[PDB]
RNA sequence: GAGCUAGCCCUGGCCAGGGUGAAGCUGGGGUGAGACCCAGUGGAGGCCCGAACCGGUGGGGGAUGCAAACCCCUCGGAUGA
RNA sequence: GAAUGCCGGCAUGAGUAACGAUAAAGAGGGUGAGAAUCCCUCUCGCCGUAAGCCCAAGGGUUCCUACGCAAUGGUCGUCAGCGUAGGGUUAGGCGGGACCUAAGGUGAAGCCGAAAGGCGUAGCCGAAGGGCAGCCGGUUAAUAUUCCGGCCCUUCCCGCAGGUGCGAUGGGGGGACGCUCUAGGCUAGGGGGACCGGAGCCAUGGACGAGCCCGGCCAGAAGCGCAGGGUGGGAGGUAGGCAAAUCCGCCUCCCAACAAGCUCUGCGUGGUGGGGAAGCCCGGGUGACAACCCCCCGAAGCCAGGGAGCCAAGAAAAGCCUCUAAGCACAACCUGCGGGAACCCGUACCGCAAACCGACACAGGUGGGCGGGUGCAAGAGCACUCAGGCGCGCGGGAGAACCCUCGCCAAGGAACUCUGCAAGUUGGCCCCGUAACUUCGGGAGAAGGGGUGCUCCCUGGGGUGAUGAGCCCCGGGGAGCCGCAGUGAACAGGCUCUGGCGACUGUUUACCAAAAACACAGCUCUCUGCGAACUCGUAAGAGGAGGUAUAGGGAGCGACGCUUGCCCGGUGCCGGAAGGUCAAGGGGAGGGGUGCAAGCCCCGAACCGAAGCCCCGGUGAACGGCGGCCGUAACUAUAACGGUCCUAAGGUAGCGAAAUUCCUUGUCGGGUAAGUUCCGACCUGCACGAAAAGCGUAACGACCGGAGCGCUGUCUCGGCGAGGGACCCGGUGAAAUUGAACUGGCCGUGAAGAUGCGGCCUACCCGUGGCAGGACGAAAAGACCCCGUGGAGCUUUACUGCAGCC
RNA sequence: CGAUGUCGGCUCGUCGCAUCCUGGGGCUGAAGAAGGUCCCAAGGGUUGGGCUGUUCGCCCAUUAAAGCGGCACGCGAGCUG
RNA sequence: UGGGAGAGGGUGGUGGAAUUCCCGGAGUAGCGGUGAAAUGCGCAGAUACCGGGAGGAACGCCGAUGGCGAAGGCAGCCACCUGGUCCACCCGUGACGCUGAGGCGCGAAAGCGUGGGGAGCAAACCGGAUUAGAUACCCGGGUAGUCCACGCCCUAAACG
RNA sequence: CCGAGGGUAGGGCCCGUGACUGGGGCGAAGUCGUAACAAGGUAGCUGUACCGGAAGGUGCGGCUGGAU
């Protein structure tokens, strides 16, 4: 339920903020937070390799449990739903009857005080994890391992999900959040439900300052630069692209496909995304 | 206005000093050259 | 060679005083219940006026200079990108 | 003898400019060979959120003292940050180290690279962050939380006593954290006292006073008192915290739970120890047995790890505590007490500056803390002042032009000019009042006005205290008084109307452009299924991201509103198992050389044979493009209509003489006495047009047009006045430039613009203040222009390669 | 071309006369008054404003008249820009 | 009080037919379309046929001249929540009624905003015919939209 | 003190007028097509939406004031 502001500054006209109404605990679990090392887009050469990064708010990384087959058959209680600034989804604090505490990413509908569990025998309730084979066909699922024991890889951003569509031998067929149909191995784990905080897409950042807070430095259009900078640089006055529109490094940026041709995972992609 | 020399003893020693020169092929050549030329100082003096 | 300058990283510091008065909250009214209205409270903001601080708009001076970019009057920002 | 030659020397300009902020000086007395310049006294002025004081960097003896003045000091010099000499910096507690980690750096393991080397978990290094024990005073010519005095504390070693399952680099807790706003109680700091202490003072008309002037504190262990922070206790279960665990986590139960208790800080008190003014007298002595008290204001600092709210969600590690593991339990650890032990480095001085960075004793630059009083609504603003610190290291005269900075002006009031450029006007606060339009916030300080001092009288609430007095902060009512004038000085918006562009706050060509440029939220296209795409790297490895399609890369457009039409023939990109072409390779019809021959060797057609290209489709918020001629209506004109050629398709809505219109000052209307600009229209748009977006848009703008009001020295049109210069005298003394010069006007001549040639005219010799017509004046081997088979940046369907990708 | 600064303005003038005005004339299709045209004449004079960077030009209000041209399209070691 | 019929409304669930698309098989020279054609599609293997998958929308027969609602309007089946309405008994209240300016709510389709969805259909648009023309009618394509959620719009031959 | 009114500044309503622009009414014999009235040669009308020289066309839903 994104929140609006009254136009009492120019920027407050359009700024919207998340409602945070689902959050129940407002400082993180000290036993689970590390320092997130800001990079600014710089690699171990010191070189910028991702332009326009840097200068955003300080953050602590919350260690998230993406395996869950860690603790088969051990139920846990949902103690808190918390804000996590390293991801779009919210996160849920789990108190295992073990005494062990862990963060998962919070699916839609998950409630404080309910219990979740993981394993081949788990009920088909929101927040449980099962190998893909034991989830009935048609189930909307999230936090999906791409390969067994390798960690939840797909459908982790706010509001997203994959849907189980069918089986074929050792493999399950998923409609990924992009619309691609892919075979994923059945021993891969996934969590029942869709990721929460689905209102996330409808936030209007509102002003230039807001992007700075997120660590996003301003983008410069190639058309604004000079020929030594960019294929679109130069020209007296304004200028159309005057060549097929290109990236700063010369390659074409309207249409030019880029996935590697002979990639082994092609045998497992059934149908490319659409829209 | 603000000029270009803003001295700094730590900076000086860490940038041009004996140990920074020895660590690197080009730095060791500098020392070899300034010795061959007979320089009284192989390295910029800084107080510490 | 980044002790100038540009960007980023870590860790610290600074921003007189005054003005405006968002949301919410409380109460009252209103209704089937509501939206909603009114008062109070509240203290939001790349909000307003203005020092420090950061700038450099117009003019005048300076032009073997006080200065290889300064000086005076004026002017922009000043809780924020 | 020339090379704007090289090195050096010395001239010219010239006793010229200048002598570095216009805060400012005068006199008396000393010293000395010599004094505007040194020392002392009195007077005057300047800073006073500093131009005072304390830290940090940087500097490195510049500090203090004696002795000096050749040079350095923009003059002088007896003086000095200068010369010579001697002296001076004292720490368990301050800062750094023998502690901790951050970015980063380095790097056993390991990975990679022709060599050099590049990476890399742990670990190590790395601080202005964490952690950790000293406060007040006195003393020196010069150091002081360092010496001394007083009162406090830390750790290490050893011993005694009491206690305890003791023991860690391992587990856990804690350390541990944002931004805005902010409560209570305090301290710092400050104001007043008719109270307390003090050398005195009575002036010039008055005052011997509840008179003036000065001062009225600082530190302190235990204990205690006020105010805060931190913190549940017990039991049972236990599979988690990579061994163990009585700890931590999770579950259950019981009790205490605005508490309390325990603990830890701050403030107050506190044994004790110190300080102590003006004035007078020679830094000192007195004051003085100094006194040391009451009231009020009051932090942004303290209690603190406090509270609330918000979203952009806010280091680490050690110290510390707890748990246990080897081990050891004759040990070990914990508490208390005693004795002993306690190292290395810095410490002088300058530090918004004459000692640092700017070649200079340079109007520039340099981070943190303190920064007093009064009044002006507030404040770090402004004026004047305290403490303190200065008068800026050339002076004396004069009182021209001219220049700079400044003040005023009759009548007019933008007539100035590219332009109200500049300068006026306006200006704070309180009150009344306020338009189109609007996205309902705004526009708005709209506009426009009224008030503002002082005195007396009456009085409302808030704070303190006590509920009163007193102090204190906001006020309100009545009546008066004075001046030209009451934010009486200083600081402090001119306003309106209407266009263009850009939504907006922001950013930019350091040092000629701040803008309409960039950015920007937002919109769209496109790539990317994760060992992602993309980027840097030979690689390893990184970034992306400890992210996962509501995500990340690339591109265009640029809030918002209403919209974004037609063309896929060409280029791009996407799709297409056929077909055509196609390299290495396969294949080997068929030849060839050589040998006696077996054989050895070479050429080699068909045919099989990828990507790419061809070919078939798709695709515009991909690159791009969106016609011509002729005819036609019952006045004329003009063509809704038609004919025909062409194209892949022939520009739609909206806009239009425009940031675009050549002809052009188009034409008409508005404003003006008059309008090449402006605004509104028309549409034959040289040459608008829909995300290189089209048309609008409230608000915003040191952007660029046009108009009006206000007011003015902008101007008619100038005048006077001020100070700093210019000028004269004393001191110190440059510069570019310069073939040599004994260097006039005209009209001619001359390489075509003559002081220098011809003819004539004019003219005694040398300066000083001024002005700029000439010396094709100076400066810069023209930057425009061309030339050189000169150079460099940039482009592409120029050539030829290479990375990369296939 | 080892540099002769370039439009317009402002300031300051000076010169030529093919004369705009004023003075003297002849002719007139000159009644007067007012003009036309030519001759002599350079002593003096030759306005303020709106538009545009403009020179020029057009317009407003006047005037005896609102002359034209040269001086490196006079004049940037005089200013503007 | 006791009963009744009903596509009355809202939420969630769920079932079969058909179309389209995709994959596999089999199979070959046309299919499609019309008044007739052409564009289109098809040897790069279409159409017709079989099996498999995905997705959206609408609910055949029953069905009616029927039923329900105030109107707009409402139709597979199931469950929940909910409205009106009729009948019987003659038990309760004792005129508590009628209408209704304003007000408030509802209000087919189209259209609008923000997400989503998108099979079929189809304004615009393109192409093929027709025609003097054909910015139409007919044919092949085809985008909004048609569908869901929330918020707007408030119109009608909203008619008996 | 009040006070006719004069001045300054800013609003509200009304009238007249304005380059140019929008449709409307009317006008003996203009140009284009033929939308409606018959099934008007595509039944018509309808709210809306989009498009087109023009009447109109078409989509969606509605009406019979439709024919056979
Ligand atoms: C700025 S003054 C600064 O530069 C000056 C120099 N002049 C010239 O070069 C002239 N020579 C002819 C050329 C012609 C053109 C014709 C035109 C149509 C382009 C006019 C411009 O120049 C003139 C710059 C270029 Cl004006 C002088 O060297 C002066 O001595 C110095 O001080
Ligand atoms: K040129
Ligand atoms: Mg908003
Ligand atoms: Mg609003
Ligand atoms: Mg939430
Ligand atoms: Mg930790
Ligand atoms: Mg990272
Ligand atoms: Mg690295
Ligand atoms: Mg990048
Ligand atoms: Mg970056
Ligand atoms: Mg993310
Ligand atoms: Mg979150
Ligand atoms: Mg798999
Ligand atoms: Mg979004
Ligand atoms: Mg952030
Ligand atoms: Mg962005
Ligand atoms: Mg950009
Ligand atoms: Mg550019
Ligand atoms: Mg550019
Ligand atoms: Mg470059
Ligand atoms: Mg290049
Ligand atoms: Mg390029
Ligand atoms: Mg280009
Ligand atoms: Mg350009
Ligand atoms: Mg152009
Ligand atoms: Mg450009
Ligand atoms: Mg082009
Ligand atoms: Mg390209
Ligand atoms: Mg690539
Ligand atoms: Mg895909
Ligand atoms: Mg600088
Ligand atoms: Mg620096
Ligand atoms: Mg240093
Ligand atoms: Mg340092
Ligand atoms: Mg350094
Ligand atoms: Mg280094
Ligand atoms: Mg070194
Ligand atoms: Mg080497
Ligand atoms: Mg070597
Ligand atoms: Mg030596
Ligand atoms: Mg060296
Ligand atoms: Mg730097
Ligand atoms: Mg501030
Ligand atoms: Mg404040
Ligand atoms: Mg105010
Ligand atoms: Mg209020
Ligand atoms: Mg609140
Ligand atoms: Mg602001
Ligand atoms: Mg204000
Ligand atoms: Mg300036
Ligand atoms: Mg000015
Ligand atoms: Mg200069
Ligand atoms: Mg200045
Ligand atoms: Mg100033
Ligand atoms: Mg200002
Ligand atoms: Mg301001
Ligand atoms: Mg401020
Ligand atoms: Mg010679
Ligand atoms: Mg030479
Ligand atoms: Mg020579
Ligand atoms: Mg030389
Ligand atoms: Mg010599
Ligand atoms: Mg010489
Ligand atoms: Mg000499
Ligand atoms: Mg001489
Ligand atoms: Mg001279
Ligand atoms: Mg000079
Ligand atoms: Mg000077
Ligand atoms: Mg000054
Ligand atoms: Mg001055
Ligand atoms: Mg003077
Ligand atoms: Mg005197
Ligand atoms: Mg004197
Ligand atoms: Mg002297
Ligand atoms: Mg002397
Ligand atoms: Mg002096
Ligand atoms: Mg003295
Ligand atoms: Mg002061
Ligand atoms: Mg020095
Ligand atoms: Mg001397
Ligand atoms: Mg001397
Ligand atoms: Mg000597
Ligand atoms: Mg000297
Ligand atoms: Mg000097
Ligand atoms: Mg002497
Ligand atoms: Mg000393
Ligand atoms: Mg000590
Ligand atoms: Mg030791
Ligand atoms: Mg250490
Ligand atoms: Mg280090
Ligand atoms: Mg260290
Ligand atoms: Mg430290
Ligand atoms: Mg210490
Ligand atoms: Mg102490
Ligand atoms: Mg001594
Ligand atoms: Mg014992
Ligand atoms: Mg923590
Ligand atoms: Mg933390
Ligand atoms: Mg910290
Ligand atoms: Mg914040
Ligand atoms: Mg104290
Ligand atoms: Mg006070
Ligand atoms: Mg407990
Ligand atoms: Mg256990
Ligand atoms: Mg503390
Ligand atoms: Mg005594
Ligand atoms: Mg502070
Ligand atoms: Mg605190
Ligand atoms: Mg760490
Ligand atoms: Mg043992
Ligand atoms: Mg033993
Ligand atoms: Mg113990
Ligand atoms: Mg040692
Ligand atoms: Mg010291
Ligand atoms: Mg300063
Ligand atoms: Mg300072
Ligand atoms: Mg000094
Ligand atoms: Mg330098
Ligand atoms: Mg000086
Ligand atoms: Mg200085
Ligand atoms: Mg004081
Ligand atoms: Mg004030
Ligand atoms: Mg002075
Ligand atoms: Mg000064
Ligand atoms: Mg004189
Ligand atoms: Mg005055
Ligand atoms: Mg005057
Ligand atoms: Mg006026
Ligand atoms: Mg006037
Ligand atoms: Mg004017
Ligand atoms: Mg103007
Ligand atoms: Mg201008
Ligand atoms: Mg003024
Ligand atoms: Mg003022
Ligand atoms: Mg208004
Ligand atoms: Mg108005
Ligand atoms: Mg207005
Ligand atoms: Mg407006
Ligand atoms: Mg409004
Ligand atoms: Mg106001
Ligand atoms: Mg006002
Ligand atoms: Mg009054
Ligand atoms: Mg008075
Ligand atoms: Mg102002
Ligand atoms: Mg802007
Ligand atoms: Mg701009
Ligand atoms: Mg715009
Ligand atoms: Mg806009
Ligand atoms: Mg914008
Ligand atoms: Mg701002
Ligand atoms: Mg520049
Ligand atoms: Mg610049
Ligand atoms: Mg420069
Ligand atoms: Mg400038
Ligand atoms: Mg510019
Ligand atoms: Mg600006
Ligand atoms: Mg820019
Ligand atoms: Mg931009
Ligand atoms: Mg913008
Ligand atoms: Mg937009
Ligand atoms: Mg999008
Ligand atoms: Mg690369
Ligand atoms: Mg290599
Ligand atoms: Mg990472
Ligand atoms: Mg609008
Ligand atoms: Mg095309
Ligand atoms: Mg095509
Ligand atoms: Mg194409
Ligand atoms: Mg091929
Ligand atoms: Mg083109
Ligand atoms: Mg083309
Ligand atoms: Mg065109
Ligand atoms: Mg069209
Ligand atoms: Mg259109
Ligand atoms: Mg036009
Ligand atoms: Mg226009
Ligand atoms: Mg044009
Ligand atoms: Mg024109
Ligand atoms: Mg023109
Ligand atoms: Mg005209
Ligand atoms: Mg007119
Ligand atoms: Mg025309
Ligand atoms: Mg374009
Ligand atoms: Mg353009
Ligand atoms: Mg375009
Ligand atoms: Mg606008
Ligand atoms: Mg606007
Ligand atoms: Mg602006
Ligand atoms: Mg601006
Ligand atoms: Mg004006
Ligand atoms: Mg004047
Ligand atoms: Mg004077
Ligand atoms: Mg004389
Ligand atoms: Mg002299
Ligand atoms: Mg001298
Ligand atoms: Mg000679
Ligand atoms: Mg001679
Ligand atoms: Mg001579
Ligand atoms: Mg002469
Ligand atoms: Mg000649
Ligand atoms: Mg001559
Ligand atoms: Mg001569
Ligand atoms: Mg001669
Ligand atoms: Mg001669
Ligand atoms: Mg001769
Ligand atoms: Mg001669
Ligand atoms: Mg002669
Ligand atoms: Mg002289
Ligand atoms: Mg002279
Ligand atoms: Mg001259
Ligand atoms: Mg001159
Ligand atoms: Mg001169
Ligand atoms: Mg000359
Ligand atoms: Mg010459
Ligand atoms: Mg000359
Ligand atoms: Mg030069
Ligand atoms: Mg040369
Ligand atoms: Mg040359
Ligand atoms: Mg040159
Ligand atoms: Mg140049
Ligand atoms: Mg040439
Ligand atoms: Mg050639
Ligand atoms: Mg040649
Ligand atoms: Mg060449
Ligand atoms: Mg080159
Ligand atoms: Mg190569
Ligand atoms: Mg030349
Ligand atoms: Mg020369
Ligand atoms: Mg020259
Ligand atoms: Mg003038
Ligand atoms: Mg006459
Ligand atoms: Mg004359
Ligand atoms: Mg001319
Ligand atoms: Mg003209
Ligand atoms: Mg006359
Ligand atoms: Mg002339
Ligand atoms: Mg000429
Ligand atoms: Mg000419
Ligand atoms: Mg000139
Ligand atoms: Mg000049
Ligand atoms: Mg000129
Ligand atoms: Mg000159
Ligand atoms: Mg000259
Ligand atoms: Mg075949
Ligand atoms: Mg589908
Ligand atoms: Mg009855
Ligand atoms: Mg409706
Ligand atoms: Mg609808
Ligand atoms: Mg025909
Ligand atoms: Mg009157
Ligand atoms: Mg006829
Ligand atoms: Mg019809
Ligand atoms: Mg008909
Ligand atoms: Mg019909
Ligand atoms: Mg018909
Ligand atoms: Mg149509």
Short mmCIF file of N, CA and C (backbone and C1' of nucleotides) in Angstrom, two decimals, chain E residues 55-78:
data_model
loop_
_atom_site.label_atom_id
_atom_site.label_comp_id
_atom_site.label_asym_id
_atom_site.label_seq_id
_atom_site.Cartn_x
_atom_site.Cartn_y
_atom_site.Cartn_z
P U E 55 23.49 54.03 -36.85
"O5'" U E 55 24.26 54.24 -38.22
"C5'" U E 55 25.52 54.87 -38.27
"C4'" U E 55 26.22 54.61 -39.57
"C3'" U E 55 25.55 55.17 -40.82
"O3'" U E 55 25.78 56.55 -40.99
"C1'" U E 55 26.24 52.96 -41.23
P C E 56 24.52 57.56 -41.01
"O5'" C E 56 23.57 56.94 -42.13
"C5'" C E 56 23.98 56.94 -43.49
"C4'" C E 56 23.20 55.94 -44.31
"C3'" C E 56 21.74 56.23 -44.54
"O3'" C E 56 21.50 57.23 -45.50
"C1'" C E 56 22.01 53.96 -44.00
P G E 57 20.23 58.21 -45.34
"O5'" G E 57 18.99 57.21 -45.20
"C5'" G E 57 18.47 56.51 -46.32
"C4'" G E 57 17.43 55.51 -45.91
"C3'" G E 57 16.17 56.07 -45.27
"O3'" G E 57 15.23 56.51 -46.24
"C1'" G E 57 16.98 54.26 -43.98
P C E 58 14.29 57.78 -45.97
"O5'" C E 58 13.11 57.20 -45.07
"C5'" C E 58 12.27 56.18 -45.57
"C4'" C E 58 11.47 55.57 -44.46
"C3'" C E 58 10.68 56.53 -43.59
"O3'" C E 58 9.46 56.96 -44.18
"C1'" C E 58 11.86 55.05 -42.21
P C E 59 8.97 58.48 -43.95
"O5'" C E 59 8.44 58.51 -42.45
"C5'" C E 59 7.44 57.61 -42.00
"C4'" C E 59 7.33 57.58 -40.50
"C3'" C E 59 7.19 58.92 -39.80
"O3'" C E 59 5.88 59.44 -39.84
"C1'" C E 59 8.79 57.63 -38.67
P C E 60 5.63 61.00 -39.55
"O5'" C E 60 5.94 61.17 -38.00
"C5'" C E 60 5.10 60.60 -37.01
"C4'" C E 60 5.47 61.13 -35.66
"C3'" C E 60 5.48 62.64 -35.54
"O3'" C E 60 4.20 63.17 -35.32
"C1'" C E 60 7.46 61.76 -34.59
P A E 61 3.83 64.63 -35.85
"O5'" A E 61 4.81 65.59 -35.05
"C5'" A E 61 4.66 65.77 -33.65
"C4'" A E 61 5.73 66.68 -33.09
"C3'" A E 61 6.00 67.96 -33.85
"O3'" A E 61 5.03 68.95 -33.63
"C1'" A E 61 8.04 66.98 -33.19
P U E 62 4.87 70.15 -34.69
"O5'" U E 62 6.04 71.13 -34.29
"C5'" U E 62 6.97 71.62 -35.23
"C4'" U E 62 8.28 71.93 -34.56
"C3'" U E 62 9.16 72.95 -35.24
"O3'" U E 62 8.78 74.29 -35.02
"C1'" U E 62 10.45 71.09 -34.72
P U E 63 8.86 75.31 -36.25
"O5'" U E 63 10.41 75.30 -36.64
"C5'" U E 63 11.37 75.82 -35.75
"C4'" U E 63 12.75 75.65 -36.30
"C3'" U E 63 13.06 76.48 -37.53
"O3'" U E 63 13.40 77.80 -37.19
"C1'" U E 63 13.77 74.26 -37.89
P A E 64 12.81 79.02 -38.03
"O5'" A E 64 13.69 78.98 -39.36
"C5'" A E 64 13.26 79.63 -40.55
"C4'" A E 64 14.33 79.54 -41.60
"C3'" A E 64 14.81 78.13 -41.89
"O3'" A E 64 14.04 77.53 -42.91
"C1'" A E 64 16.67 79.57 -41.51
P A E 65 13.35 76.10 -42.69
"O5'" A E 65 14.52 75.06 -42.88
"C5'" A E 65 15.10 74.87 -44.16
"C4'" A E 65 16.55 74.49 -44.04
"C3'" A E 65 16.84 73.17 -43.36
"O3'" A E 65 16.72 72.07 -44.25
"C1'" A E 65 18.33 74.85 -42.58
P A E 66 15.35 71.26 -44.38
"O5'" A E 66 15.57 69.97 -43.49
"C5'" A E 66 16.62 69.05 -43.76
"C4'" A E 66 17.85 69.34 -42.95
"C3'" A E 66 18.45 68.14 -42.23
"O3'" A E 66 19.86 68.33 -42.17
"C1'" A E 66 17.94 69.78 -40.65
P G E 67 20.86 67.14 -42.55
"O5'" G E 67 21.25 67.47 -44.05
"C5'" G E 67 21.87 68.69 -44.40
"C4'" G E 67 22.42 68.60 -45.80
"C3'" G E 67 23.50 67.55 -46.02
"O3'" G E 67 22.94 66.26 -46.18
"C1'" G E 67 24.10 69.57 -47.08
P C E 68 23.63 64.97 -45.53
"O5'" C E 68 24.65 64.47 -46.64
"C5'" C E 68 24.23 64.28 -47.98
"C4'" C E 68 25.39 64.34 -48.94
"C3'" C E 68 26.66 63.64 -48.49
"O3'" C E 68 26.62 62.23 -48.62
"C1'" C E 68 27.21 65.76 -49.35
P G E 69 27.67 61.34 -47.80
"O5'" G E 69 29.09 61.90 -48.24
"C5'" G E 69 29.80 61.30 -49.31
"C4'" G E 69 31.06 62.05 -49.63
"C3'" G E 69 32.26 61.79 -48.74
"O3'" G E 69 32.88 60.55 -48.97
"C1'" G E 69 32.10 64.09 -49.18
P G E 70 33.86 59.96 -47.85
"O5'" G E 70 35.15 60.89 -47.92
"C5'" G E 70 36.11 60.71 -48.95
"C4'" G E 70 37.33 61.58 -48.75
"C3'" G E 70 38.17 61.29 -47.52
"O3'" G E 70 38.98 60.15 -47.66
"C1'" G E 70 37.89 63.61 -47.72
P C E 71 39.25 59.20 -46.40
"O5'" C E 71 40.26 60.04 -45.50
"C5'" C E 71 41.51 60.47 -46.00
"C4'" C E 71 42.13 61.45 -45.05
"C3'" C E 71 42.36 60.94 -43.63
"O3'" C E 71 43.60 60.27 -43.52
"C1'" C E 71 41.29 63.04 -43.56
P A E 72 43.81 59.13 -42.42
"O5'" A E 72 42.74 58.04 -42.82
"C5'" A E 72 42.70 57.48 -44.13
"C4'" A E 72 42.65 55.98 -44.08
"C3'" A E 72 41.93 55.38 -42.87
"O3'" A E 72 41.34 54.15 -43.28
"C1'" A E 72 44.11 54.57 -42.93
P C E 73 40.00 53.56 -42.59
"O5'" C E 73 39.00 53.47 -43.82
"C5'" C E 73 38.78 54.60 -44.63
"C4'" C E 73 37.31 54.87 -44.78
"C3'" C E 73 36.54 55.13 -43.50
"O3'" C E 73 36.62 56.49 -43.13
"C1'" C E 73 35.33 53.66 -44.93
P G E 74 36.68 56.94 -41.59
"O5'" G E 74 37.71 58.15 -41.62
"C5'" G E 74 39.05 57.96 -42.05
"C4'" G E 74 39.98 58.70 -41.15
"C3'" G E 74 40.14 58.12 -39.75
"O3'" G E 74 41.09 57.08 -39.69
"C1'" G E 74 39.74 60.45 -39.62
P C E 75 40.84 55.86 -38.67
"O5'" C E 75 40.85 56.56 -37.23
"C5'" C E 75 42.07 56.98 -36.63
"C4'" C E 75 41.84 57.81 -35.39
"C3'" C E 75 41.10 57.13 -34.25
"O3'" C E 75 41.95 56.33 -33.47
"C1'" C E 75 40.17 59.26 -34.61
P G E 76 41.87 54.73 -33.57
"O5'" G E 76 40.91 54.31 -32.37
"C5'" G E 76 41.11 54.80 -31.05
"C4'" G E 76 41.26 53.69 -30.05
"C3'" G E 76 42.55 52.89 -30.15
"O3'" G E 76 43.57 53.50 -29.38
"C1'" G E 76 40.66 51.43 -29.92
P A E 77 45.11 53.41 -29.80
"O5'" A E 77 45.89 53.86 -28.48
"C5'" A E 77 45.90 53.06 -27.32
"C4'" A E 77 47.22 53.15 -26.60
"C3'" A E 77 47.67 54.54 -26.18
"O3'" A E 77 46.99 55.03 -25.04
"C1'" A E 77 49.48 53.39 -27.13
P G E 78 46.75 56.61 -24.85
"O5'" G E 78 46.02 57.12 -26.17
"C5'" G E 78 44.83 56.52 -26.67
"C4'" G E 78 43.60 57.06 -25.99
"C3'" G E 78 42.42 56.12 -25.96
"O3'" G E 78 42.59 55.12 -24.98
"C1'" G E 78 41.68 58.29 -26.53
#
